[PDB]
Amino acid sequence: PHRYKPGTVALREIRRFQKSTELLIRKLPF
DNA sequence: GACTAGGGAGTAATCCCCTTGGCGGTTAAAACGCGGGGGACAGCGCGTACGTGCGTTTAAGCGGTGCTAGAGCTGTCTACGACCAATTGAGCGGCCTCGGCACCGGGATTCTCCAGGG
């Protein structure tokens, strides 16, 4: 099982967003 | 002077491109649920770092003083800024590229998990 401990992918995924700069909110519901 | 001829506007028919609604198909993001585990937090012990009482002094407020150099207003002038337009060029309004950006692939590189022994 390729299950990582809670938070192991969290730091990576935070890095992924804080690199990005796009719109985080879907336009139609807004 | 009477009637004639031709062409762009008045009237009208053709085209036809442009969209209003609904509905189906299909991918992507959102929605929901479970095993398990790591984060939250209680119970507690302590020590040591402040919370507090009292002695013994420097210091701001006290009380007053003798002025002294910087701050407010009185003329006064004069260098300068807000009053027409010709201009004419500094720069913007509209278009046409090919290049850097968009983005994904092959690979080297690197970041992480485990079940064992070492």
Listing DSSP states for chain A in one string gives: --PPPTTHHHHHHHHHHHH--S--S-TTT-
Cα Rg for chain A, rounded, in angstroms? 13
Query: In this structure, what token pair is assigned to residue A6?
Result: 């809670």
Nucleotide nearest A26, CA–C1', reads: B29
Nucleotide nearest A6, CA–C1', reads: B38
> What is the distance in angstroms measured between the alpha-carbon CA of A25 and the sugar C1' of B76?
70
Method: cryo-EM
Burial of A25 (0-12, 13-18, 19+ CB in 10 A): exposed
> What is the distance in angstroms measured between the alpha-carbon CA of A13 and the sugar C1' of B35?
23
Query: In this structure, what token pair is assigned to residue A18?
Result: 């804080």
Cα–Cα distance for residue pair A7/A13, rounded to 1 Å: 10
The reported resolution of this PDB entry, expressed in Å, is 3.5
User: Residue with structure tokens 């967003």?
Assistant: A17
